[PDB]
Write a protein that binds this ligand. Structure first.
Ligand SMILES: CCCCCCCC/C=C/CCCCCCCC(=O)O
Ligand SMILES: CCCCCCCC/C=C\CCCCCCCC(=O)O
Ligand SMILES: CCCCCCCC/C=C\CCCCCCCC(=O)O
Ligand SMILES: CCCCCCCC/C=C\CCCCCCCC(=O)O
Ligand SMILES: CCCCCCCCCCCCCCCCCCCC
Ligand SMILES: CCCCCCCCCCCCCCCCCCCC
Ligand SMILES: CCCCCCCCCCCCCCCCCCCC
Ligand SMILES: CCCCCCCCCCCCCCCCCCCC
Ligand SMILES: CCCCCCCCCCCCCCCCCCCC
Ligand SMILES: CCCCCCCCCCCCCCCCCCCC
Ligand SMILES: CCCCCCCCCCCCCCCCCCCC
Ligand SMILES: CCCCCCCCCCCCCCCCCCCC
Ligand SMILES: CCCCCCCCCCCCCCCCCCCC
Ligand SMILES: CCCCCCCCCCCCCCCCCCCC
Ligand SMILES: CCCCCCCCCCCCCCCCCCCC
Ligand SMILES: CCCCCCCCCCCCCCCCCCCC
Ligand SMILES: CCCCCCCCCCCCCCCCCCCC
Ligand SMILES: CCCCCCCCCCCCCCCCCCCC
Ligand SMILES: CCCCCCCCCCCCCCCCCCCC
Ligand code: NA
Ligand code: NA
Ligand code: NA
Ligand code: NA
Ligand code: NA
Lengths: 268, 268, 269, 268, 268
């Protein structure tokens, strides 16, 4: 069977197949994913009037991200269930090519919305002391775009060409480190001239940002984190990857948005 | 045939099949389920301005839960109809593997939204006395998560491994008892310093909470409540399980939310 | 072919099949059905601020009913088209078992929302005199639930067991008569102490309620209203049943809601 | 092949089939149709507060019509694509019976919403002089209903029985002429006691009403407007019918609604 | 195989087929497309109260365009996935005629909404000096309609008849040049008598308009921009065409709308 430049989920699905637990769990975690985003959308719209006019752009950009996340995770949930079909003889779900191959790439291109907006929205709550608003925004947007596009190219080769996969991943990581650098500056300048309560929240935001954003490259490498022919190059790795994505999505978008809202309230 | 770690609905559907009444009833009760949640969503949004600003977070969290419940029950209703197909020769609906196996697990993972939010929202209406807000919240959220996750693991073995099914269920019950304990404290502290009218409503809320939340473990054990090869290990048990879930869902989310709203009005 | 405890639509569909007119008409009337409910939802939300705060719960409960009706009629419309497939050799639509058997039961269980809310909402516009609010509400809700549940059980036997069908229908009718009784009291007490304009509207509401609610038991008996092998035990009866349901749904929910809104306006300052 | 009392689209689709242009164009025009209605819905809701309270019922009834039109045109667009399937051997789309026969009847029954509401809404903007509000409303609603129902019956026989088709069409036309008569009176009385600017708009509304409403009977006769076995009794007539419907739908509902709104602003 | 007057995507899909990257990328870019439009819809509605009453029509028309774009790009995304199916023997996606042929024509007919509204909305923010409002509007609407209709006819022949394709394209370009002419005048008159800030934004709007609108004819010619049997007459050209459309859609509708909103704020 010829799959070409396809994600490893298809190789596991085409050879070993997926147990009821592996298939159902992946279906459930992706379903919880889009449910959280639509719930978040409602929360961000309904709490818009809870902060001063100047901070409301944060709620609006959170809502924008929720729409992106909901549509993508909904599409990705349908893509999962249509790509793997139950075989009654062996009692496992195997690649059903009529449903198309499964691809994580859907997520990557929608990050062209999420990443720029998530980085932009904090600049509407915090006050910079040294750094220029337009300069920070432009660095976030340029590095964000390059990080996503290079990673998008890389993930197509996660099985067909391990070398390209790692090189593109490495280039992508360079832009990621730059984003972490600039965000650290923004957090530090943001802490200057606000109440200790506000400073505590910004500290929490930095930890959340650091861990949640790092999970994405984790999901990228997931199948190989226990090396070639490891425990994770199986249905277990498939489950782990989608679980990690869902934890990252909720943390980086919904919880991040809630914390920014709480900061906005303390500064109001 | 080989089903593996699948819910008992699939075993009944694969062997005996479902009569028109059993199949249609299950379809109708799940349809009523999601209809009630979307109707509730509209009610909670439209009555937001009927309570003082400080109580409006209760309406908002009810709305959040309604979105979760609607999406899940809608998906679960489609999963039911796609998993069982009519056999014209015998006049019964049999497992159709091309629609995937039916799994109640969808509900469990969405409880990661419902349970934490349902427990949290009462803390925006009642005033604690001796207990700390953050302490009660953290206990609810930790015990809630552990209760759900342990039960989620257990239900995959309700047929393939009765021992694992009961052990995980037992561990889950421990966390359930802790939640009941903390909620009892919250209700008692909540009754302190409010009108007898408010105290009457809180008393009703406690009864509703107790009965409605107990129905869930009831649904878990349903197939075995009349022992192995009992009256309930049949299409009758399948009907009973989904009926009990629907009664529990409407009571625990919609009716609970309405009572909290009425309490909020009394305190306004 | 073995169908069991199935609605008569499936027996006609499995034996005679449906002409283009019968199949298309049923599809069109169910489509109009859900379209009216979504349009009504928008109307009730957009006119909320046209009445005093105390009457706004009427608009809200109308909206709640519209959501229920829309979702159910939309589902029922899809169920119809998926259950009957065209046979090119004879030019008729026949039962397609892969789409599931057609069942009217979907409606019945959603009435557990509609009936209680429709009866409850009038108590937010009219003022009772000799009757207690909680007492009337409880009678409406208990009798409403029993009426629906008994009818739901009955309709599964409309072909497989005519006796069970009629017995459950009869029991259901008892609870229906009780509802009509209580509603009559509510209308009379509602007329007391309001302008003749308001009394006129309440009179219209009573007529609408009486006719529209009676259509439902009419739809129940439809296949047998011309006897066991009659004109109506055909695709004509299938068309008639869904037509009557749609007329009853629009009248009992949408038009009823509009009249209550107009009453609320007349009582408003 | 036996089709019975079916629309002529099915006869062309079953014999000649449809070229890529004919099939795609019909799909595109119906898609544009429902897109316009959802866009209009948004416009009528967002401009509600642009007119005095007394004229807002016009926006509300426009919105009601948009919901009707959107749902129907969306359904009709799906019905078209599911009823005709590509034959790779000859490169044309042929009747696919598994998708059901195509029927324009969907439109007719939804006119039971559109026609009464479109006629009613003008009575909330203009002031009658000689005529009674209730009398005009009742004539519009009775004649509207009879016009639609008689036409609905007629269109089922547009191929199977040309005589019935024309007789029902003729009876329907009688009720149409009555509506045109009453609307003319309403326009004239509406012009009395308003600014020349308002009178100009009412003049435009009358022209729009006359042309747009006449297109519907045009669509009815379309297949026979060049006689039996004419140029239009082909895929060309199929294209022309759906094009004319779309032009009529946009003009009679959306543009009509906009003009009434502009009149309401002039009178505010 | 006989395709007739079909888009070149179908010819590549029927002969060479599409690699995983080509098929997935096209699916991802179209998905990002509709996601951006629904996110934009939310942004334009939520920021309506950020500008003076007289400028709010701009937000409303942006919202109207977003509804059009969302519905069309959503439909086009579904059309793409249903028209090409994976062949497990060769590992490529081939034309699946049961899903209908793919056609870009969907976009063209929805431009009958987008183009007129995009050109109209700027006239609600800028003040004309020498030019008459009604005159400019009428020229935009007439030339817009003719540009779209002529291009719509042309694209059906992009493979079956290269001559017709180029002639209709040329006629269409004439109307395009007229639009560019009128828009240049509007921008110049708009710049007269407003703040430096306002003039800067109008300058940006003109550049964005010029580049973004030119991309559309670029997408039209895409398959032949490297001559007959060139590098772009392949799956690479298919990818490039949909990519260019998506860049043009986001720029011409969303970014254009945001800039107009920012101009409205500076003038408020
Ligand atoms: C598929 C159904 C899911 C519906 C949920 C989608 C959410 C989109 C937002 C809609 C609700 C927001 C309405 C604005 C709040 C009104 C404020 C108020 O009434 O006080
Ligand atoms: C099918 C879709 C139906 C479900 C609708 C979901 C909710 C939508 C938001 C409605 C809230 C409207 C608030 C307006 C309040 C007001 O006008 O005073
Ligand atoms: C489409 C949803 C309409 C909501 C209206 C919001 C108007 C406003 O926020 O000013
Ligand atoms: C399915 C996905 C649903 C998301 C689609 C959203 C489109 C429209 C949303 C408009 C809702 C805005 C309501 C206005 C609220 C104004 C306020 O509260 O300040
Ligand atoms: C996986 C769990 C995520 C559930 C969240 C879904 C929606 C988010 C809304 C939560 C807001 C909580 C309010 C806290 C702020 C008030 C203090
Ligand atoms: C790829 C990242 C760029 C996304 C931003 C596009 C929208 C921003 C609008 C222009 C900036 C105005 C301030
Ligand atoms: C099967 C039970 C149906 C539940 C009702 C459906 C949802 C309606 C939302 C609640 C409305 C209740 C009215 C509250 C009024 C109290 C004052
Ligand atoms: C402080 C909140 C942290 C959670 C503490 C849980 C207490 C133990 C209850 C588990 C019962 C077994
Ligand atoms: C495992 C379930 C936990 C639910 C997470 C809820 C996310 C909201 C976090 C916000 C907390 C800050 C508000 C203080 C109260
Ligand atoms: C959001 C956190 C959910 C954690 C659940 C993971 C449990 C794994 C499911 C079964 C594993 C058995 C193999
Ligand atoms: C076939 C019946 C059509 C019903 C129309 C759909 C719902 C619209 C709501 C009624 C509008 C009229 C109320 C105006 C009176 C004041
Ligand atoms: C099935 C019987 C009908 C009950 C449905 C009503 C649900 C809402 C409960 C309202 C309780 C508060 C009234 C005071
Ligand atoms: C034999 C039919 C099954 C009865 C179901 C009872 C309905 C209860 C709904 C609440
Ligand atoms: C086929 C093109 C029809 C246009 C579709 C757009 C529908 C929405 C209505 C927009 C009308 C704007 C006119 C505003 C007039 C000034 C007040
Ligand atoms: C498919 C979409 C159909 C929409 C159904 C309607 C749902 C509720 C929308 C109503 C919005 C209320 C707005 C009122 C405020 C108006 C002021 C501007
Ligand atoms: C038959 C078509 C006409 C139906 C009219 C719509 C019904 C709603 C109007 C009733 C309110 C009376 C004032
Ligand atoms: C609206 C009522 C018309 C439906 C009847 C259709 C024609 C029946 C012919 C047999
Ligand atoms: C591929 C590009 C994705 C970007 C589009 C995201 C969705 C549209 C939302 C628009 C975002 C606007 C950003 C705010 C502009 C700041 C202007 C200042 C106002 C005071
Ligand atoms: C007074 C404004 C009325 C115009 C309604 C909108 C119609 C837009 C026309 C677009 C041109 C397409 C040909
Ligand atoms: Na599957
Ligand atoms: Na089924
Ligand atoms: Na069908
Ligand atoms: Na087709
Ligand atoms: Na495909």
């Amino acid at each position: 069977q010829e799959l070409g430049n396809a994600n490893f989920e298809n190789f596991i699905g085409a050879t070993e197949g997926f147990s009821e637990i592996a298939y159902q769990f992946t279906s459930h975690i992706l379903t919880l994913g889009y449910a959280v985003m639509l719930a978040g959308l409602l929360y961000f719209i309904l709490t818009i009037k809870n902060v001063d006019k100047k901070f409301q752009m944060s709620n609006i950009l959170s809502a924008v991200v929720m729409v992106s996340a909901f549509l993508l995770l909904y599409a990705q949930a349908q893509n999962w269930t249509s790509s793997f079909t139950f075989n009654e003889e062996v009692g496992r779900y195997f690649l059903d090519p009529s449903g198309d191959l499964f691809n994580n790439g859907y997520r990557y291109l929608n990050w062209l919305i999420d990443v720029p907006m998530l980085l932009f929205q904090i600049l509407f709550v915090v006050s910079l002391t040294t750094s220029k608003f337009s300069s920070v925004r432009n660095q976030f947007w340029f590095s964000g775009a390059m990080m996503i596009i290079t990673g998008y190219i890389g993930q197509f080769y996660e099985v067909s060409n391990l070398t390209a996969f790692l090189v593109w991943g490495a280039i992508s990581s360079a832009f990621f480190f730059h984003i972490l650098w600039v965000m650290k500056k923004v957090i530090n300048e943001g802490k200057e001239g606000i109440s200790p309560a506000g400073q505590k929240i910004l500290s929490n935001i930095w930890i959340l940002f650091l861990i949640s954003w790092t999970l994405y490259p984790g999901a990228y490498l997931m199948p190989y984190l226990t090396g070639v022919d490891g425990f994770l190059y199986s249905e277990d790795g498939v489950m782990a990857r989608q679980l990690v994505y869902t934890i990252a999505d909720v943390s980086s978008k919904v919880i991040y948005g809630v914390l920014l809202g709480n900061l906005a309230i303390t500064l109001s």
